[PDB]
Amino acid sequence: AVKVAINGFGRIGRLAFRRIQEVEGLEVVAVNDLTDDDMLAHLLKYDTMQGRFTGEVEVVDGGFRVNGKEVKSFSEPDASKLPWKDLNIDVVLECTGFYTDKDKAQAHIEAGAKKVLISAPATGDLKTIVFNTNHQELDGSETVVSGASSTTNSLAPVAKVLNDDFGLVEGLMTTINAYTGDQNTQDAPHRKGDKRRARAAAENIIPNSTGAAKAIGKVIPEIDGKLDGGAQRVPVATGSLTELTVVLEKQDVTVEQVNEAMKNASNESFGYTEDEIVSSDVVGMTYGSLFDATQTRVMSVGDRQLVKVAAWYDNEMSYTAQLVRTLAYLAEL
Amino acid sequence: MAVKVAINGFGRIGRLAFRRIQEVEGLEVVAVNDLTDDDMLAHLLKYDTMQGRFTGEVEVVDGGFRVNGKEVKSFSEPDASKLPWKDLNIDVVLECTGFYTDKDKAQAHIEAGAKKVLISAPATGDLKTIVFNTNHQELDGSETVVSGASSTTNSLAPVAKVLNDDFGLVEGLMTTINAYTGDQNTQDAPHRKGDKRRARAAAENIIPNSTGAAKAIGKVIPEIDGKLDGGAQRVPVATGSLTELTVVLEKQDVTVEQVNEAMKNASNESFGYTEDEIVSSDVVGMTYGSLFDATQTRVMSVGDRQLVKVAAWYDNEMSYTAQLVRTLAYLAE
Amino acid sequence: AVKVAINGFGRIGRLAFRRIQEVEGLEVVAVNDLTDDDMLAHLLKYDTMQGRFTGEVEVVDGGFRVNGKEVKSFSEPDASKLPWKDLNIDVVLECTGFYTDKDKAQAHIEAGAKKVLISAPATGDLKTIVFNTNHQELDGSETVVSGASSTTNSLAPVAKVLNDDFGLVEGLMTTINAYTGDQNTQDAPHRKGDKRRARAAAENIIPNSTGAAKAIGKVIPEIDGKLDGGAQRVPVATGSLTELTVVLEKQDVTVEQVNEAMKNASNESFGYTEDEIVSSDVVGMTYGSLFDATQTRVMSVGDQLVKVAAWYDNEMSYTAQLVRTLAYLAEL
Amino acid sequence: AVKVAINGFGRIGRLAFRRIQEVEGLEVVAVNDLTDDDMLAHLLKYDTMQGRFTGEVEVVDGGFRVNGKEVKSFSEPDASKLPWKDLNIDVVLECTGFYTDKDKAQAHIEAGAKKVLISAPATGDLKTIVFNTNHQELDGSETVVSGASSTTNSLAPVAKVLNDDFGLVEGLMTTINAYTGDQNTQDAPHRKGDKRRARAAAENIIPNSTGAAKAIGKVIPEIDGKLDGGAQRVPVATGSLTELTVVLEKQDVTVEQVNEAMKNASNESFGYTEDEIVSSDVVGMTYGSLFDATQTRVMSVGDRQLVKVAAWYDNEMSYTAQLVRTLAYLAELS
Ligand SMILES: NC(=O)c1ccc[n+]([C@@H]2O[C@H](COP(=O)([O-])OP(=O)(O)OC[C@H]3O[C@@H](n4cnc5c(N)ncnc54)[C@H](O)[C@@H]3O)[C@@H](O)[C@H]2O)c1
Ligand SMILES: NC(=O)c1ccc[n+]([C@@H]2O[C@H](COP(=O)([O-])OP(=O)(O)OC[C@H]3O[C@@H](n4cnc5c(N)ncnc54)[C@H](O)[C@@H]3O)[C@@H](O)[C@H]2O)c1
Ligand SMILES: NC(=O)c1ccc[n+]([C@@H]2O[C@H](COP(=O)([O-])OP(=O)(O)OC[C@H]3O[C@@H](n4cnc5c(N)ncnc54)[C@H](O)[C@@H]3O)[C@@H](O)[C@H]2O)c1
Numbered sequence A: 001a002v003k004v005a006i007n008g009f010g011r012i013g014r015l016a017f018r019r020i021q022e023v024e025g026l027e028v029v030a031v032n033d034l035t036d037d038d039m040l041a042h043l044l045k046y047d048t049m050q051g052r053f054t055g056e057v058e059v060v061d062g063g064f065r066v067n068g069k070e071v072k073s074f075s076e077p078d079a080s081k082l083p084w085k086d087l088n089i090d091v092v093l094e095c096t097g098f099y100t101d102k103d104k105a106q107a108h109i110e111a112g113a114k115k116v117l118i119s120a121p122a123t124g125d126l127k128t129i130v131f132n133t134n135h136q137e138l139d140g141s142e143t144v145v146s147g148a149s150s151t152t153n154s155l156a157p158v159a160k161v162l163n164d165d166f167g168l169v170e171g172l173m174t175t176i177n178a179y180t181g182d183q184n185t186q187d188a189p190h191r192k193g194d195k196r197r198a199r200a201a202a203e204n205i206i207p208n209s210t211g212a213a214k215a216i217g218k219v220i221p222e223i224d225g226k227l228d229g230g231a232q233r234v235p236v237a238t239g240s241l242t243e244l245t246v247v248l249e250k251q252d253v254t255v256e257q258v259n260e261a262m263k264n265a266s267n268e269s270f271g272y273t274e275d276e277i278v279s280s281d282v283v284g285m286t287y288g289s290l291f292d293a294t295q296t297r298v299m300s301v302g303d304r305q306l307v308k309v310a311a312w313y314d315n316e317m318s319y320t321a322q323l324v325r326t327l328a329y330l331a332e333l
Numbered sequence B: 001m002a003v004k005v006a007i008n009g010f011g012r013i014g015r016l017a018f019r020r021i022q023e024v025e026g027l028e029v030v031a032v033n034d035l036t037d038d039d040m041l042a043h044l045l046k047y048d049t050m051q052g053r054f055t056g057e058v059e060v061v062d063g064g065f066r067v068n069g070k071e072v073k074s075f076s077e078p079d080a081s082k083l084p085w086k087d088l089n090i091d092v093v094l095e096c097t098g099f100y101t102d103k104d105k106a107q108a109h110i111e112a113g114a115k116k117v118l119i120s121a122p123a124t125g126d127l128k129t130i131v132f133n134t135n136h137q138e139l140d141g142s143e144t145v146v147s148g149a150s151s152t153t154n155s156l157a158p159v160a161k162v163l164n165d166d167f168g169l170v171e172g173l174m175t176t177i178n179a180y181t182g183d184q185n186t187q188d189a190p191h192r193k194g195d196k197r198r199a200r201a202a203a204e205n206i207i208p209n210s211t212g213a214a215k216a217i218g219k220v221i222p223e224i225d226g227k228l229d230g231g232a233q234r235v236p237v238a239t240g241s242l243t244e245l246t247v248v249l250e251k252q253d254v255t256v257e258q259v260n261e262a263m264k265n266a267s268n269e270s271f272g273y274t275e276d277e278i279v280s281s282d283v284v285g286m287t288y289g290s291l292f293d294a295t296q297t298r299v300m301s302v303g304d305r306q307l308v309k310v311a312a313w314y315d316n317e318m319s320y321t322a323q324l325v326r327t328l329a330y331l332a333e
Numbered sequence C: 001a002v003k004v005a006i007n008g009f010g011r012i013g014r015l016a017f018r019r020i021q022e023v024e025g026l027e028v029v030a031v032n033d034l035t036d037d038d039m040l041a042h043l044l045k046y047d048t049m050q051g052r053f054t055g056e057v058e059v060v061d062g063g064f065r066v067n068g069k070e071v072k073s074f075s076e077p078d079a080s081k082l083p084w085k086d087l088n089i090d091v092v093l094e095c096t097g098f099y100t101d102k103d104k105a106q107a108h109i110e111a112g113a114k115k116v117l118i119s120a121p122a123t124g125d126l127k128t129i130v131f132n133t134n135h136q137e138l139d140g141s142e143t144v145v146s147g148a149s150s151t152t153n154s155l156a157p158v159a160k161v162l163n164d165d166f167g168l169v170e171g172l173m174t175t176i177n178a179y180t181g182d183q184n185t186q187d188a189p190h191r192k193g194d195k196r197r198a199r200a201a202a203e204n205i206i207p208n209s210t211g212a213a214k215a216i217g218k219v220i221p222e223i224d225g226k227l228d229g230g231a232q233r234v235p236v237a238t239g240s241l242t243e244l245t246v247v248l249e250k251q252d253v254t255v256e257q258v259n260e261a262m263k264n265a266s267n268e269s270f271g272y273t274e275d276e277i278v279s280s281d282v283v284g285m286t287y288g289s290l291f292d293a294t295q296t297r298v299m300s301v302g303d304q305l306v307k308v309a310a311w312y313d314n315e316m317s318y319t320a321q322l323v324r325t326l327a328y329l330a331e332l
Numbered sequence D: 001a002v003k004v005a006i007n008g009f010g011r012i013g014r015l016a017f018r019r020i021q022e023v024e025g026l027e028v029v030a031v032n033d034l035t036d037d038d039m040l041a042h043l044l045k046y047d048t049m050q051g052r053f054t055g056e057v058e059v060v061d062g063g064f065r066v067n068g069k070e071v072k073s074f075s076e077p078d079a080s081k082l083p084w085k086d087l088n089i090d091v092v093l094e095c096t097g098f099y100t101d102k103d104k105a106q107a108h109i110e111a112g113a114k115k116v117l118i119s120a121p122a123t124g125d126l127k128t129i130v131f132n133t134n135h136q137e138l139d140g141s142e143t144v145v146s147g148a149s150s151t152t153n154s155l156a157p158v159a160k161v162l163n164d165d166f167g168l169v170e171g172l173m174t175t176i177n178a179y180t181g182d183q184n185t186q187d188a189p190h191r192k193g194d195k196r197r198a199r200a201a202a203e204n205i206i207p208n209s210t211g212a213a214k215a216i217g218k219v220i221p222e223i224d225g226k227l228d229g230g231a232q233r234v235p236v237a238t239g240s241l242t243e244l245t246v247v248l249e250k251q252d253v254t255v256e257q258v259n260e261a262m263k264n265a266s267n268e269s270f271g272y273t274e275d276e277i278v279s280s281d282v283v284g285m286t287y288g289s290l291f292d293a294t295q296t297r298v299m300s301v302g303d304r305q306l307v308k309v310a311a312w313y314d315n316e317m318s319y320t321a322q323l324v325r326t327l328a329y330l331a332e333l334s
Helices: A011-020 A037-045 A150-166 A255-264 A317-331 B012-022 B038-046 B151-167 B256-265 B318-332 C011-021 C037-045 C150-166 C255-265 C316-330 D011-021 D037-045 D102-111 D150-166 D255-264 D317-331
Strands: A002-007 A026-032 A057-059 A063-066 A069-074 A091-094 A115-118 A144-146 A168-178 A206-209 A227-234 A240-248 A270-273 A289-292 A297-301 A304-313 B003-008 B027-033 B058-060 B064-067 B070-075 B092-095 B116-119 B145-147 B169-179 B207-210 B228-235 B241-249 B271-274 B290-293 B298-302 B305-314 C002-007 C026-032 C057-059 C063-066 C069-074 C091-094 C115-118 C144-146 C168-178 C206-209 C227-234 C240-248 C270-273 C289-292 C297-299 C305-312 D002-007 D026-032 D057-059 D063-066 D069-074 D091-094 D115-118 D144-146 D168-178 D206-209 D227-234 D240-248 D270-273 D289-292 D297-301 D304-313
Touching (some): A011 A026, A011 A091, A011 A317, A037 A057, A091 A317, A168 B305, A227 B298, A240 B305, A255 A289, A255 A304, A297 B169, A297 B228, A304 B169, B012 B038, B012 B092, B012 B318, B027 B318, B038 B058, B092 B318, B116 B318, B151 B169, B151 B256, B151 B290, B151 B305, B256 B271, B256 B305, C002 C011, C002 C316, C011 C026, C011 C037, C011 C091, C037 C057, C091 C316, C150 C168, C168 D297, C227 D297, C255 C305, C305 D168, D011 D037, D011 D091, D011 D317, D037 D057, D091 D317, D150 D289, D150 D317
Parallel strands (some): A002 A091, A026 A069, A115 A144, A168 A227, B003 B027, B116 B145, B169 B228, B271 B290, C002 C091, C026 C069, C091 C115, C168 C227, D002 D026, D115 D144
Antiparallel strands (some): A168 A240, A206 A227, A289 A304, A297 A304, B169 B241, C063 C069, C240 C305, C289 C305, C297 C305, D057 D063, D206 D227, D240 D304
């Protein structure tokens, strides 16, 4: 077993834990957060959007047991202090949100971990990886890697096909997003000064920034600088949709050419559908991106075309499945 | 000059138009028609989940109800041609049922004795389709049946007008992010119009849906006919919507702040401008047809190329209803 | 195969369909609603709260296929017209909400069905059955049966235990309910004149009446007229909680006696839990009622008022109960 | 002007600010929180459930201006450090949730404030006040007062009438509550170890404890220890309902007697309705409690009656209006 520790037993940490239970040879030996074993065990077992955990969870004092397997729990807000050397950690899933930087995340390496995979975009000389778009950039010598963002994971395969098959000139993105835990429950001061994330998460359409389209070049260099865009955060608790509006090089692009090109590029990470689904239908899915042929649009005036595509993603589980694929790749090669 | 109005369909738009007409001198609602008793109609006027309590006094009689001592006749006739409009001397019917959205169908009110019909939606037939303060001057006063267009068209037209007049519109795609409406189901259930997406629980989903606001924009601004396309995403807010517009303009050295100034200069009673980081509930109850949001403006350029992106808020209920009542008052005068 | 037809392919119809797939020897041969095969197939496949249907659904013209099994679909708003004699229907699950009366439901028997199980409380000389509380009242001769209500199904096993083990004197109930399709999406005239169910379902706490406590005597006669209560419908799309506040005959009762008594009575229909769960955590569960030991309260002044709470997925909890009763009714 | 400062510009602080604008001779001169002026001004101006603030708000550096009136803003997490002596504060509305104790709240008095009114239940030798039920307990010598809870404010006038008119034997309460800011937006570790408040606030029915019924004796002593109950927190962002199930001393009570007794006791703090309203209809209302005659139930077996009533409250504005009435009463005594 590849010995994994999860730092930050949040939405992404707990779902990565559930996902790892379904992946042979991957094992979570340790978990770190800021609370007691009873609260960690409870939130693994019960999950508002993702459902009950099928396995048996029981609290001990080391931490908790899952199907007889013991998971050590810790409460260390500073990652350098974690006993990773004593537990022989191979890879930390860094899912706190507070170590989104190569140097900060190095704390886990000091602590005795062999490698750190960060469950978000991160600053520093790091590779930023979307599984099945650029995971092959990983050579096995990396110490600290970023798993990029949920949006980037919905967007990169779509953008890669658009550029490979048609040539991407430029594009603007809107992602329509499930609200997340960095948003307040009720209108209140926001810790990062964001006057929109300050607002009641579940009662608003809230515009917000994203670096997914601006920083796409980190996963596909060829289209670096060719995209921009923002998010609208809306009151569903998970499940999201990326809409992309592009100018292509080819000007006799068609709705069929785009769909077929997406269908043909599909894999475990990039799915394809022609059903008139809605956001609830993608909750718990394991594609990093699900291309929706029903939303494809080509607009033309005189000769010039504007193309528009949409892809679904469960910002939780789609992203988590991608993260676990990358983990598994990083542990093996 | 008490212009005598009858409201057909005392629904979201009908009730709100009633409330609006109380605030507008010389407009009077003498009659109301729906499919339920006076008690139910009076109660829904008094109490409104999103728009708040009606300030006036409402009491139930049998002719119908009284509002501030003024008697309103109420009827329950599913067939408009049977309504006693000749006996009540109706000047104008606000047709707000959703079941007469066609010139010939709506003519049923004219047969019944009404002088004019204004339809609270897009409508088929040789009709004028009007966005107040964009093309209300197309009305000459001879019209028998007029369409007040859609909520989305009212949010979009003044933005698109400015973009074309000041920059030249080449082409554009739209996404409106919409509050759910009463044509959507409470729970997943057979939909009456066979729509597999409006079939789904309205308040638990991001729901792609079609709209004609962009495609049919030429009905209100002919110069840009066929230059726009796009759709909607219905999301779980009960009212308050956002129109996002991604355009190619003729001019190519355009900047964020050129665009924002051009909108601010075109602002009026129907077309608001804001630079505050607001969210959807901040527009609930507002009486602008469209509220341009300078904080959302984006210009994306690669090489030569520019894609421009703008956003305008609207309360699909009250924004639309103030527009409808302005057109009503113009049509009467 | 017991040959079932589902009248009304709604929340309860479709979920009974799903449930019947998991149940050997039960088969849905036909389905009736007010829409096309395309819509019906789609809604079976995709479900906002209950998740994707695992099987394969494909539309045909007779109706649709589910894992290669053909289901005939119909569009008859009048049940007496349905070709139940031609299809040899054993039992109809009447799930429209429009035949909730023995005589009205008889329309299916006219049509050629042998039996009708109504997915709701119903008026008439009918048995009203909560599986595992009073299903043994069914002799097999019954023509039209009621499966009672979701709330009744949540309440009956709790109330039975309280009476058998402590003696029930009187009780008030509040059920906190997921909103349902009889509520409006937006404030609008309500077809039954209910000024509260008129209101936007997902934006309000909405008081509403319920006969679960008042008509509890229909399933447990011994406590007839000893309960009353209402509902508060709130903005979750499924999952509900029944709170019961009671006077017991015994007065030295404690939290830990109450919870033990509940745990001992647990079965296929009546679950027990000591986890601090919330409504989400019961979505899709198949217990008719999940007693929550963490909510038990004993209040006393001088010489007691007792308070308990049970979860239920008003959808799946009720459906599962309905399919158990179906299966029991077929097997007599 | 009575010079007021608001410690904690949260839900209750901002709404009390907005309420104080509507009340002549009450003036907010200073505000304290943990953020900048830009965020404080913005959140006053825009309010998801209570709507846009009608007045003009503009940011300055001392703080912000509201209709030309300057409000000083601060960012001091420790209250004793606040310059209350320099600004001559008469009363602090203590609305942080972190000073709900007489001794802890004394920090404002050390700072130079004359009196502190805590927007919550509080421990210590404090009077706990529900305006129009027991505000006459205040003599004007009090240093630190509690304004009780939103539930207590919804409940006390109802319970007072039931006891005065019929004699209260015992009762159980369930309040069905709007979710609040001590709940998590998504399932996540809770700071107070509460495994239910840990869950996604807007996706769940969440049982929770409340002291409103148990601690009713603090505001009406005669019925001390006669009530108990809990809450169910549900996905509305504001607006709540108290249900009260009671045994009364009188046993021939009817729906009609109960409803009349409630109607006769109505005032600026305790409203009465016979309309089939729902929670949204009470958002922004200024009654502390709105009795709902449509929900009154009398259940009887043989001779034994159980009575059930319900009262609405905007846990936000019903509470805030009660708080400001108490504020004004406290200011207009010594
Ligand atoms: N966001 C919006 O709510 C919005 C915006 C712009 C336009 N509209 C248009 O306004 C119209 C009404 O929409 P709504 O949202 O108010 O819906 P609604 O359901 O609230 O109202 C329609 C009302 O008319 C009644 N009615 C239906 N058929 C009738 C008949 N034949 N005779 C008399 N009364 C009848 C219904 O009982 C209901 O009260 C629709 O065409 C809609 O597209 C709605
Ligand atoms: N929580 C719950 O959903 C719940 C729980 C238990 C029982 N019930 C009861 O079950 C029944 C259905 O409730 P639901 O929530 O599934 O409703 P629903 O609205 O989702 O389903 C009813 C279906 O019947 C169809 N229908 C209506 N009239 C018809 C007719 N005349 N002929 C054929 N089809 C018709 C409708 O199109 C709809 O699909 C009701 O009696 C209800 O009170 C509901
Ligand atoms: N929300 C309700 O329904 C309700 C009703 C009645 C009473 N209350 C009580 O009012 C108090 C606050 O409630 P809320 O709902 O307004 O919470 P809230 O979190 O919205 O607002 C509290 C504010 O205080 C600020 N704050 C925290 N610590 C501070 C520090 N010590 N110094 C300065 N400012 C600080 C926070 O930044 C926040 O803006 C609590 O005691 C609560 O129990 C709440």
